[PDB]
Amino acid sequence: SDQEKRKQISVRGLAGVENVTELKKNFNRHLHFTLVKDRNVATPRDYYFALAHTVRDHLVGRWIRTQQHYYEKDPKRIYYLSLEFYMGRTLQNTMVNLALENACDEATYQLGLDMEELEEIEEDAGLGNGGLGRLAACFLDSMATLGLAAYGYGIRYEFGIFNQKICGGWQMEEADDWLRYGNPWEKARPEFTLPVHFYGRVEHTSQGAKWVDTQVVLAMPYDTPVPGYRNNVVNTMRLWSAKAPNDGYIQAVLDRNLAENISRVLYPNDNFFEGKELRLKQEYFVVAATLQDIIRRFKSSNFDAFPDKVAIQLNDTHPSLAIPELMRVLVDLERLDWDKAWEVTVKTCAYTNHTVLPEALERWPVHLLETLLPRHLQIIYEINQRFLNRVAAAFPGDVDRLRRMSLVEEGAVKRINMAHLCIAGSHAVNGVARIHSEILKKTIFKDFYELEPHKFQNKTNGITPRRWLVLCNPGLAEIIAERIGEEYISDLDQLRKLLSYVDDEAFIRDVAKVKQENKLKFAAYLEREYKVHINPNSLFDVQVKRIHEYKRQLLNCLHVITLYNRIKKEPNKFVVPRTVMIGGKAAPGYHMAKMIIKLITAIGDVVNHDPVVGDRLRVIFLENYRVSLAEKVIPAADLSEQISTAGTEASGTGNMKFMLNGALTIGTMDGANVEMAEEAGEENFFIFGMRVEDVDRLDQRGYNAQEYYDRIPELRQIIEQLSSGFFSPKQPDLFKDIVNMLMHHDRFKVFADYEEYVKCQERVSALYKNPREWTRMVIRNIATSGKFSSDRTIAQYAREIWGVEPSRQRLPAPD
Amino acid sequence: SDQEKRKQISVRGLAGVENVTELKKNFNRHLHFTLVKDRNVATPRDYYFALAHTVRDHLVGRWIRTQQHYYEKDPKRIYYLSLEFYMGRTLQNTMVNLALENACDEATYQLGLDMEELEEIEEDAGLGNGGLGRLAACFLDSMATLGLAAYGYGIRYEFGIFNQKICGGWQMEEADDWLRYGNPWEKARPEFTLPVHFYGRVEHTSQGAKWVDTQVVLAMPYDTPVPGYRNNVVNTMRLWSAKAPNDGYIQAVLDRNLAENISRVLYPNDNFFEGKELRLKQEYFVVAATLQDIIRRFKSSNFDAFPDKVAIQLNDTHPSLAIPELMRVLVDLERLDWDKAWEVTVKTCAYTNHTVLPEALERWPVHLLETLLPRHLQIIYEINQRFLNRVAAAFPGDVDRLRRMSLVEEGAVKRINMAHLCIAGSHAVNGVARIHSEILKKTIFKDFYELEPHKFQNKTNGITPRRWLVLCNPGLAEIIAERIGEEYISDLDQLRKLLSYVDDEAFIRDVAKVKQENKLKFAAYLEREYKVHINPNSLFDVQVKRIHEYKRQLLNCLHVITLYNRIKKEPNKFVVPRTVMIGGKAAPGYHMAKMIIKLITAIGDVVNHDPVVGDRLRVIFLENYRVSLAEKVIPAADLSEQISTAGTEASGTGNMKFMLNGALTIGTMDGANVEMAEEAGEENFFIFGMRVEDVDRLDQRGYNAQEYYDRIPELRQIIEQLSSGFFSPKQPDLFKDIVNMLMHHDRFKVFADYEEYVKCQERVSALYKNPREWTRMVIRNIATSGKFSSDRTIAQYAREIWGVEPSRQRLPAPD
Ligand SMILES: *Cc1c(COP(=O)(O)O)cnc(C)c1O
Ligand SMILES: *Cc1c(COP(=O)(O)O)cnc(C)c1O
Ligand SMILES: OC[C@H]1O[C@H](O)[C@H](O)[C@@H](O)[C@@H]1O
Ligand SMILES: OC[C@H]1O[C@H](O)[C@H](O)[C@@H](O)[C@@H]1O
């Protein structure tokens, strides 16, 4: 067979040019041949798919070229391991990054279809809980835009974060069947399935340890392309799916599901550790399959150069088993001596920490590890002993420090501290915001910092300006581009140039106009799909993020009740109208968080129907908060609520989304809020409350909520209302748990920041009364938000941790 | 929005002409855009998929046009309900029916690929057990070729008939993961999902019965196109998949699998009833979803005309619940009076019976029905009472007949006789071969025939000449076409014209040549994938079909042992060399059938390694017999073994496949064998053994196997060898169960036909010694096989049962 003939098999002149005529032809081909429909039976959903497949074609052509480029060049490859990737919708993002939205708009118009309506049909890919998962998605976009040979590796959950329904003011969870109609963006790769082992026992041969009698589960990969901004670079996100191997008869076949349950559902916990076996299986599953893939790719173009061609970033401790697994492969399978394998491992791995809350830290009981992964437990103990021997050498006689730094925690229930394991086996450990990285060094990881100061770094979080500005706020993007060009989209620091228009009346008018249109649009979306009626001239006070005690939605609640009581006291006095919106999901088994949601809706029941309040105050709970809803509400916000107790929010990212979209911020000196105020100037930020040091003082002497109750009349009145059933007539003591918690068991000191919060909120209202000054402060915010672009964050990771150089060089088009 | 614009959305000038240039372009598009591969990483499997998708495009264009045609014309629609559809491979069949194989051959050649190698990569769609499932697939091909508006409705099993492995001579079952790499022929239709109810209770309202508190399982359809032979008609096969509705949290999500287990696996029983709950769920599942689909289609272009636009054919009693379900919908939901609904039901339904063996008859215990389908049990009792009242009127005082005809069977375990239910609610009941249809009237359904003689018919089975001649035996098809043209492919009766070449030396030579090449090819396939070495000059003695006691593979075994003992007795005497091949799967829990497989392999262990036997006798067990293997072995056969006990094989279809492909038949006067000998002339058939009447005589007086053992020395010697461990040295009494069964509990009288069988086999050997005469008899067989084309069978069903006229009119091409 003449091999020269196969040269005809090329992507060389395929999808056609990105002009209207060709797009329509392809749309037509997909509607008929791909979906097997015709114009008579086709529904909007069918048209959405035909368009998605049409855009996919162009995306795929570049995907193939990028992967070919990497094979040829063989650059150092970056593997971002995460158990969460909160992607959201893909159609628009793809059109924008490929510069296809105009042609698609035109092509669909000529066919008698409306593209914006089609886009709203796409399901959100919710394979994440919140900030951690969304950060991974932003990073993927940035790594592609910066031309890095990066791969995101995770799990392809059949069901993502649940859909939230509000029934009788209570949250109800509904499985998120996001794959029901299919996912046009993913490509199954059954030919690349790999085995993953569980259980079994370790037996010692003359030449080494052997893991035998193990149960096998197959890992089948699904590839999703991730496009960079107009550089023709398309990277890969590889998600693993669990499959049972093919080796009474009926029952045996039915029992295959047991193995496939590993990738069935995403654990809905945000910043909380649940030590369940299934979760541990998920963690090893993603790790074992991923590392096999990494080693194979490395061997296809000894291990001394592994760290020069491979960098593995661990997103939190979830994929931490990658350390002992890499050691297992190198020592047991490749037969490298321990010290050499360890050297390679440490130089390859880097770990990112995302929280300081003790209940979020993964500490796995050893009994679960010895039965599920016997060989890894052995390796972990060995790692521990050799690590502790190093500590003893640097601090002779410090037996206390040895107990504190151990990877193994004593107590009746022996547990393995996964964070300690990550620090020991990583060459770099980073926090996600300056204040957080400092706290890591001053507190929880103080011992580790003293031993290896060089390991600790900071990499302040960021968000991608493509989805979080260009995509969700085209109106804002347009007026900014008309003054400074389009270069800021991949170089956000250029927003700085806007400081020159702070006094320009034209700009001031335009910024305020874009915001009003966004607010009008949002109020319309609310009436259409969720029936009620907010006043579009009120101040849009928004707090959207997962429901958590540390995020203090309750503090927000106390303020709106204060506002309501104030109006009732003096009904004929003027007040800046406000629409207070709070949204977010609560983990299913988090009782207090679910009680907080009920309190929010109960407050709205009273306030929203009080005739003397009228249009001056409206409290709305936005149900099913997710990425696509964030894209709608954030651009319509005036005030962003970032009120976590100082020292608890590692960084936050929603805060950056709001800053970039023209909302002013009211918050504590926590996480990235510190750096945002730093960039915009503290006078252009609404800061209040205790600083980290003040929280420490209170803790030393002891927090007594009663003191505040006794000294603040307005606060006392609120608690009295809550206990008397003022917000729950048919069940007077419904909120007894919330009241008791605030009075006697509040770890987040809500009462301690109440007074400063209310006073600060008063200043916000004062400034809103002056549109011109409000808008001028907003411009000072938008103009200094450049530091918070994920392109900056990724550039720092690449240079300071991965040892690779970013690049904006564009690759050639398929043809 | 100008609706005129949408007229651009058409299939009108799409796939391009069916010439080489366009095919290559599309192949290229699919390899890159559909599969996301390139010429560097593509494997043959990838190339196979690219070709399949390319051919699919042309198939889909006609599919859409056919469905449009039916909407316009609104012809009476035929619904073939079956729990099995044994489809086999689809690529080649599609190319042949669309007349694309030459262009595809050329296009692939020019790309440097070999099409025959690509075709061998396709997985068999094994959603069937054997004859019943394969008949449904042949019928689908014929209904399309005859231009009928037909739909096949069944279940999309995740795992079809198991893959059979032989380990140590024993059968081992392995799950058939046929969807592992995907199915390019099916199209998921999540938008057409329908609910199916289970359990619950019946409550009586003032206006009627209501089925409430039921559990819901969703039925999602998957459509597969089925092309007719060159008429551009593409029908639909709709297979249902079970899905759980979206309404601790983790466990709740994991438990969704329980509902999806309904369509997980095909029960591997052939002609045997297993009363398991899951099976019953499967039966109602397919029925409930299908009928909803039928009613919807009917209402979209009152019920008095239902029978004029709808015909429902029940393939065996598996889909029998369609009768009480249709009644439930018409009475409970549409509120028709009972008598009118019943009239409509009977006129709509027709039932096909496939077996007479009592252990194959479905008799469901009422306790299972009252808990799973309470409302259907009520309807069935009502149906029974009104049916029995009719019997009493026609035969006053015949209380015995009333007990015999009842749909309800008394005994401790009350059961519902599904066959009686089908007869009562169908306007037509048919057997599948003349002798079988007669037995139905003379025995098991005698009572029903006396009450309604007009209901009983016969519809002799057939096979499709496309797959069973043109596809699997191109060499034969070609030499036949060179003398009589290509019109026989859709009018098999034309093979008759070949009787004019019985004496032509050229033809005689060609027929014998085609067979030798087929045998050479098969012997090559055997050495390649299954290593051993059969002599291609020996007589190919083949028996392939499911392992069953009634099919009497054991009788075959006795003959080969007789042959072996004969050679050993007189080693230097000449004998016509023979390669005896036996293949077929055994149901997992059928102990005796699994013992028979072991006996076959044990016989081969001895015979195949006996040096004095040499190349004169070889016994081979063909493992994993399935549709694609049948396509390989049948065309290479010389002798077809159809030796079931007279009166047990309803029809048989493998027998017809062998006749059409140049093999002579040795068999009993059973099933369709009677009609085949009738068509070819009994002198051109090797008939032997008891006729149905002789079996009846033996039964009356009593079957005593000992008599034959005592009177036949050669038989006695064989049994002695089996009991002594001659075929199982390390375990002397391994075959004790087989020997005891043959001697004391043989329901199929193997010994009674032994003598005539051996004598008849002697005549076969005699004729084979004379190639010229052997081949001339073969021609007399091939030339008279026309009656056994499924086109004939379907034509008869359409005219005599469905009330629709067949048609060979070709529809216009897409463009
Ligand atoms: C940005 C984002 C988050 C993170 O919000 P924070 O206020 O940092 O906690 C959570 N959920 C979604 C859907 C997001 O878009
Ligand atoms: C034709 C066919 C059958 C039916 O064979 P019989 O000899 O009629 O029992 C069974 N299995 C397969 C795979 C078939 O092709
Ligand atoms: O690092 C991304 C996010 O991770 C976690 O969700 C932290 O709670 C949050 O503060 C941070 O922004
Ligand atoms: O009707 C199709 C087939 O159904 C069953 O398999 C019968 O056993 C067989 O005789 C018949 O040919």
PDB file of N, CA, C and O in Angstrom, chain A residues 1 6 8-9 24 28 33 35-39 56 68 110 112 180 189 191 246 257 261 264, chain B residues 1 6 8-9 24 28 33 35-39 56 68 110-112 180 189 191 246 257 261 264:
ATOM      1  N   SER A   1       0.854  -1.229   0.000  1.00  0.00           N
ATOM      2  CA  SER A   1       0.000   0.000   0.000  1.00  0.00           C
ATOM      3  C   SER A   1       0.871   1.254   0.000  1.00  0.00           C
ATOM      4  O   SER A   1       1.634   1.478   0.944  1.00  0.00           O
ATOM      5  N   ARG A   6      -1.800   8.368   1.641  1.00  0.00           N
ATOM      6  CA  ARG A   6      -2.404   8.837   2.884  1.00  0.00           C
ATOM      7  C   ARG A   6      -2.168  10.314   3.161  1.00  0.00           C
ATOM      8  O   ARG A   6      -2.797  10.880   4.050  1.00  0.00           O
ATOM      9  N   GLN A   8      -3.143  12.581   1.498  1.00  0.00           N
ATOM     10  CA  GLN A   8      -4.376  13.249   1.083  1.00  0.00           C
ATOM     11  C   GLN A   8      -5.243  13.458   2.320  1.00  0.00           C
ATOM     12  O   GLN A   8      -6.099  14.341   2.346  1.00  0.00           O
ATOM     13  N   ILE A   9      -5.027  12.618   3.330  1.00  0.00           N
ATOM     14  CA  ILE A   9      -5.766  12.693   4.582  1.00  0.00           C
ATOM     15  C   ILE A   9      -5.153  13.830   5.399  1.00  0.00           C
ATOM     16  O   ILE A   9      -4.178  13.640   6.132  1.00  0.00           O
ATOM     17  N   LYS A  24     -23.471  28.932   6.814  1.00  0.00           N
ATOM     18  CA  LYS A  24     -24.849  28.526   6.553  1.00  0.00           C
ATOM     19  C   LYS A  24     -24.901  27.121   5.974  1.00  0.00           C
ATOM     20  O   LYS A  24     -25.751  26.313   6.354  1.00  0.00           O
ATOM     21  N   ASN A  28     -26.537  23.874   7.856  1.00  0.00           N
ATOM     22  CA  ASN A  28     -27.476  23.020   7.155  1.00  0.00           C
ATOM     23  C   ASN A  28     -27.058  21.556   7.198  1.00  0.00           C
ATOM     24  O   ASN A  28     -27.887  20.668   7.442  1.00  0.00           O
ATOM     25  N   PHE A  33     -27.695  15.986   8.655  1.00  0.00           N
ATOM     26  CA  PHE A  33     -26.868  14.794   8.831  1.00  0.00           C
ATOM     27  C   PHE A  33     -26.431  14.469  10.261  1.00  0.00           C
ATOM     28  O   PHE A  33     -26.409  13.301  10.646  1.00  0.00           O
ATOM     29  N   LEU A  35     -27.831  15.815  13.328  1.00  0.00           N
ATOM     30  CA  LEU A  35     -28.982  15.699  14.210  1.00  0.00           C
ATOM     31  C   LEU A  35     -30.150  14.899  13.636  1.00  0.00           C
ATOM     32  O   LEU A  35     -31.042  14.488  14.375  1.00  0.00           O
ATOM     33  N   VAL A  36     -30.137  14.671  12.326  1.00  0.00           N
ATOM     34  CA  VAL A  36     -31.198  13.929  11.652  1.00  0.00           C
ATOM     35  C   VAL A  36     -32.545  14.593  11.912  1.00  0.00           C
ATOM     36  O   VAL A  36     -33.467  13.987  12.473  1.00  0.00           O
ATOM     37  N   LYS A  37     -32.636  15.858  11.518  1.00  0.00           N
ATOM     38  CA  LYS A  37     -33.863  16.641  11.659  1.00  0.00           C
ATOM     39  C   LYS A  37     -34.038  17.383  10.339  1.00  0.00           C
ATOM     40  O   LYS A  37     -33.191  17.295   9.452  1.00  0.00           O
ATOM     41  N   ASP A  38     -35.153  18.089  10.209  1.00  0.00           N
ATOM     42  CA  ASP A  38     -35.405  18.903   9.029  1.00  0.00           C
ATOM     43  C   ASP A  38     -36.069  20.173   9.549  1.00  0.00           C
ATOM     44  O   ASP A  38     -36.387  20.266  10.736  1.00  0.00           O
ATOM     45  N   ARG A  39     -36.262  21.157   8.683  1.00  0.00           N
ATOM     46  CA  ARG A  39     -36.859  22.407   9.126  1.00  0.00           C
ATOM     47  C   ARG A  39     -38.284  22.279   9.656  1.00  0.00           C
ATOM     48  O   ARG A  39     -38.771  23.176  10.341  1.00  0.00           O
ATOM     49  N   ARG A  56     -17.991  24.118  16.401  1.00  0.00           N
ATOM     50  CA  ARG A  56     -17.069  23.073  16.849  1.00  0.00           C
ATOM     51  C   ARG A  56     -16.087  22.686  15.748  1.00  0.00           C
ATOM     52  O   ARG A  56     -14.901  22.460  16.002  1.00  0.00           O
ATOM     53  N   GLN A  68      -0.481  18.858  17.119  1.00  0.00           N
ATOM     54  CA  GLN A  68       0.577  18.468  16.200  1.00  0.00           C
ATOM     55  C   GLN A  68       1.814  19.334  16.536  1.00  0.00           C
ATOM     56  O   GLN A  68       2.950  18.854  16.604  1.00  0.00           O
ATOM     57  N   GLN A 110     -29.748  35.291   8.507  1.00  0.00           N
ATOM     58  CA  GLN A 110     -30.155  34.990   7.138  1.00  0.00           C
ATOM     59  C   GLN A 110     -30.967  33.701   7.031  1.00  0.00           C
ATOM     60  O   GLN A 110     -31.639  33.465   6.026  1.00  0.00           O
ATOM     61  N   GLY A 112     -33.189  32.984   9.317  1.00  0.00           N
ATOM     62  CA  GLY A 112     -34.413  33.281  10.033  1.00  0.00           C
ATOM     63  C   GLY A 112     -34.373  32.858  11.484  1.00  0.00           C
ATOM     64  O   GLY A 112     -35.411  32.545  12.065  1.00  0.00           O
ATOM     65  N   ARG A 180     -28.132  15.001  29.590  1.00  0.00           N
ATOM     66  CA  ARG A 180     -29.388  14.509  29.018  1.00  0.00           C
ATOM     67  C   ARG A 180     -29.522  14.631  27.500  1.00  0.00           C
ATOM     68  O   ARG A 180     -29.927  13.684  26.827  1.00  0.00           O
ATOM     69  N   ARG A 189     -12.859   8.989  24.193  1.00  0.00           N
ATOM     70  CA  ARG A 189     -11.647   8.334  23.710  1.00  0.00           C
ATOM     71  C   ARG A 189     -11.540   6.950  24.329  1.00  0.00           C
ATOM     72  O   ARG A 189     -10.633   6.687  25.110  1.00  0.00           O
ATOM     73  N   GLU A 191     -10.459   4.318  23.160  1.00  0.00           N
ATOM     74  CA  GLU A 191      -9.217   3.673  22.771  1.00  0.00           C
ATOM     75  C   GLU A 191      -8.074   3.974  23.745  1.00  0.00           C
ATOM     76  O   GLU A 191      -7.039   3.305  23.713  1.00  0.00           O
ATOM     77  N   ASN A 246     -14.704  -6.059  31.379  1.00  0.00           N
ATOM     78  CA  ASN A 246     -15.672  -7.070  30.926  1.00  0.00           C
ATOM     79  C   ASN A 246     -15.491  -8.454  31.539  1.00  0.00           C
ATOM     80  O   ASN A 246     -16.203  -9.408  31.192  1.00  0.00           O
ATOM     81  N   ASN A 257     -22.449  -1.620  37.536  1.00  0.00           N
ATOM     82  CA  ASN A 257     -22.724  -0.252  37.932  1.00  0.00           C
ATOM     83  C   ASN A 257     -21.929   0.148  39.168  1.00  0.00           C
ATOM     84  O   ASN A 257     -21.522   1.299  39.301  1.00  0.00           O
ATOM     85  N   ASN A 261     -19.909   3.851  39.589  1.00  0.00           N
ATOM     86  CA  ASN A 261     -20.418   4.859  40.503  1.00  0.00           C
ATOM     87  C   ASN A 261     -19.336   5.864  40.888  1.00  0.00           C
ATOM     88  O   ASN A 261     -19.644   6.952  41.358  1.00  0.00           O
ATOM     89  N   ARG A 264     -19.956   9.085  39.161  1.00  0.00           N
ATOM     90  CA  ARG A 264     -21.363   9.417  39.014  1.00  0.00           C
ATOM     91  C   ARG A 264     -21.796  10.805  39.458  1.00  0.00           C
ATOM     92  O   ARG A 264     -22.588  11.449  38.771  1.00  0.00           O
TER      93      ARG A 264
ATOM     94  N   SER B   1     -39.853  37.666  12.211  1.00  0.00           N
ATOM     95  CA  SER B   1     -38.855  36.814  11.492  1.00  0.00           C
ATOM     96  C   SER B   1     -39.472  36.222  10.227  1.00  0.00           C
ATOM     97  O   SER B   1     -40.441  35.462  10.308  1.00  0.00           O
ATOM     98  N   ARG B   6     -36.328  30.344   6.228  1.00  0.00           N
ATOM     99  CA  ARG B   6     -36.065  28.984   6.686  1.00  0.00           C
ATOM    100  C   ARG B   6     -36.135  27.941   5.581  1.00  0.00           C
ATOM    101  O   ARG B   6     -35.726  26.801   5.786  1.00  0.00           O
ATOM    102  N   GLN B   8     -34.350  27.790   3.205  1.00  0.00           N
ATOM    103  CA  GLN B   8     -32.959  27.534   2.833  1.00  0.00           C
ATOM    104  C   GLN B   8     -32.490  26.288   3.576  1.00  0.00           C
ATOM    105  O   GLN B   8     -31.552  25.616   3.147  1.00  0.00           O
ATOM    106  N   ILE B   9     -33.135  26.007   4.705  1.00  0.00           N
ATOM    107  CA  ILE B   9     -32.811  24.847   5.524  1.00  0.00           C
ATOM    108  C   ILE B   9     -33.454  23.632   4.857  1.00  0.00           C
ATOM    109  O   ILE B   9     -34.624  23.314   5.093  1.00  0.00           O
ATOM    110  N   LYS B  24     -14.275  10.779  -0.852  1.00  0.00           N
ATOM    111  CA  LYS B  24     -12.966  11.003  -0.243  1.00  0.00           C
ATOM    112  C   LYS B  24     -12.965  12.275   0.590  1.00  0.00           C
ATOM    113  O   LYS B  24     -12.413  12.306   1.691  1.00  0.00           O
ATOM    114  N   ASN B  28     -12.524  12.404   4.658  1.00  0.00           N
ATOM    115  CA  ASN B  28     -11.564  13.310   5.260  1.00  0.00           C
ATOM    116  C   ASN B  28     -12.204  14.195   6.322  1.00  0.00           C
ATOM    117  O   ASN B  28     -11.643  14.386   7.410  1.00  0.00           O
ATOM    118  N   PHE B  33     -12.941  16.176  11.715  1.00  0.00           N
ATOM    119  CA  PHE B  33     -13.962  16.863  12.504  1.00  0.00           C
ATOM    120  C   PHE B  33     -14.861  15.983  13.375  1.00  0.00           C
ATOM    121  O   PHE B  33     -15.186  16.360  14.500  1.00  0.00           O
ATOM    122  N   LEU B  35     -14.267  12.530  14.328  1.00  0.00           N
ATOM    123  CA  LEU B  35     -13.474  11.711  15.232  1.00  0.00           C
ATOM    124  C   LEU B  35     -12.330  12.448  15.927  1.00  0.00           C
ATOM    125  O   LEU B  35     -11.785  11.955  16.911  1.00  0.00           O
ATOM    126  N   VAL B  36     -11.979  13.626  15.421  1.00  0.00           N
ATOM    127  CA  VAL B  36     -10.897  14.426  15.985  1.00  0.00           C
ATOM    128  C   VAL B  36      -9.605  13.617  16.003  1.00  0.00           C
ATOM    129  O   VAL B  36      -9.007  13.375  17.060  1.00  0.00           O
ATOM    130  N   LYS B  37      -9.197  13.180  14.817  1.00  0.00           N
ATOM    131  CA  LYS B  37      -7.963  12.415  14.640  1.00  0.00           C
ATOM    132  C   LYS B  37      -7.277  13.006  13.415  1.00  0.00           C
ATOM    133  O   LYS B  37      -7.816  13.900  12.764  1.00  0.00           O
ATOM    134  N   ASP B  38      -6.078  12.521  13.125  1.00  0.00           N
ATOM    135  CA  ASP B  38      -5.351  12.946  11.938  1.00  0.00           C
ATOM    136  C   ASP B  38      -4.684  11.687  11.399  1.00  0.00           C
ATOM    137  O   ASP B  38      -4.732  10.635  12.041  1.00  0.00           O
ATOM    138  N   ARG B  39      -4.080  11.773  10.222  1.00  0.00           N
ATOM    139  CA  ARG B  39      -3.455  10.596   9.640  1.00  0.00           C
ATOM    140  C   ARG B  39      -2.300  10.020  10.452  1.00  0.00           C
ATOM    141  O   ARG B  39      -1.908   8.874  10.244  1.00  0.00           O
ATOM    142  N   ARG B  56     -23.115   6.818   6.309  1.00  0.00           N
ATOM    143  CA  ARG B  56     -24.284   7.217   7.095  1.00  0.00           C
ATOM    144  C   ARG B  56     -24.932   8.477   6.529  1.00  0.00           C
ATOM    145  O   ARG B  56     -26.159   8.596   6.480  1.00  0.00           O
ATOM    146  N   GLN B  68     -40.613  12.109   5.532  1.00  0.00           N
ATOM    147  CA  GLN B  68     -41.388  13.238   5.041  1.00  0.00           C
ATOM    148  C   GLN B  68     -42.513  12.664   4.149  1.00  0.00           C
ATOM    149  O   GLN B  68     -43.677  13.071   4.220  1.00  0.00           O
ATOM    150  N   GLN B 110      -7.882   4.722  -3.122  1.00  0.00           N
ATOM    151  CA  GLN B 110      -7.130   5.923  -3.472  1.00  0.00           C
ATOM    152  C   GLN B 110      -6.542   6.630  -2.252  1.00  0.00           C
ATOM    153  O   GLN B 110      -5.641   7.460  -2.383  1.00  0.00           O
ATOM    154  N   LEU B 111      -7.046   6.302  -1.066  1.00  0.00           N
ATOM    155  CA  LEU B 111      -6.545   6.919   0.153  1.00  0.00           C
ATOM    156  C   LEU B 111      -5.498   6.026   0.802  1.00  0.00           C
ATOM    157  O   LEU B 111      -4.910   6.379   1.827  1.00  0.00           O
ATOM    158  N   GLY B 112      -5.268   4.870   0.189  1.00  0.00           N
ATOM    159  CA  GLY B 112      -4.290   3.931   0.699  1.00  0.00           C
ATOM    160  C   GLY B 112      -4.837   3.027   1.780  1.00  0.00           C
ATOM    161  O   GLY B 112      -4.091   2.580   2.650  1.00  0.00           O
ATOM    162  N   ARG B 180     -19.077  -0.005  23.545  1.00  0.00           N
ATOM    163  CA  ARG B 180     -17.803   0.537  24.023  1.00  0.00           C
ATOM    164  C   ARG B 180     -17.194   1.654  23.175  1.00  0.00           C
ATOM    165  O   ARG B 180     -16.760   2.677  23.703  1.00  0.00           O
ATOM    166  N   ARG B 189     -32.729  10.241  20.862  1.00  0.00           N
ATOM    167  CA  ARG B 189     -33.824  11.200  20.763  1.00  0.00           C
ATOM    168  C   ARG B 189     -34.335  11.531  22.156  1.00  0.00           C
ATOM    169  O   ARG B 189     -35.467  11.207  22.496  1.00  0.00           O
ATOM    170  N   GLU B 191     -35.414  14.168  23.314  1.00  0.00           N
ATOM    171  CA  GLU B 191     -36.564  15.052  23.246  1.00  0.00           C
ATOM    172  C   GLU B 191     -37.886  14.284  23.165  1.00  0.00           C
ATOM    173  O   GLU B 191     -38.955  14.864  23.367  1.00  0.00           O
ATOM    174  N   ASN B 246     -35.596  12.983  37.164  1.00  0.00           N
ATOM    175  CA  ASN B 246     -34.711  13.778  38.029  1.00  0.00           C
ATOM    176  C   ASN B 246     -35.289  14.124  39.396  1.00  0.00           C
ATOM    177  O   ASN B 246     -34.668  14.842  40.193  1.00  0.00           O
ATOM    178  N   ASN B 257     -29.495   4.252  39.199  1.00  0.00           N
ATOM    179  CA  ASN B 257     -29.139   3.096  38.399  1.00  0.00           C
ATOM    180  C   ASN B 257     -30.198   2.005  38.482  1.00  0.00           C
ATOM    181  O   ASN B 257     -30.437   1.294  37.510  1.00  0.00           O
ATOM    182  N   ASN B 261     -31.631  -0.165  35.134  1.00  0.00           N
ATOM    183  CA  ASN B 261     -31.271  -1.562  34.962  1.00  0.00           C
ATOM    184  C   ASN B 261     -32.243  -2.281  34.032  1.00  0.00           C
ATOM    185  O   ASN B 261     -31.924  -3.338  33.503  1.00  0.00           O
ATOM    186  N   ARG B 264     -30.619  -2.880  30.754  1.00  0.00           N
ATOM    187  CA  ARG B 264     -29.201  -3.181  30.842  1.00  0.00           C
ATOM    188  C   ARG B 264     -28.708  -4.412  30.099  1.00  0.00           C
ATOM    189  O   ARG B 264     -27.652  -4.367  29.469  1.00  0.00           O
TER     190      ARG B 264
END
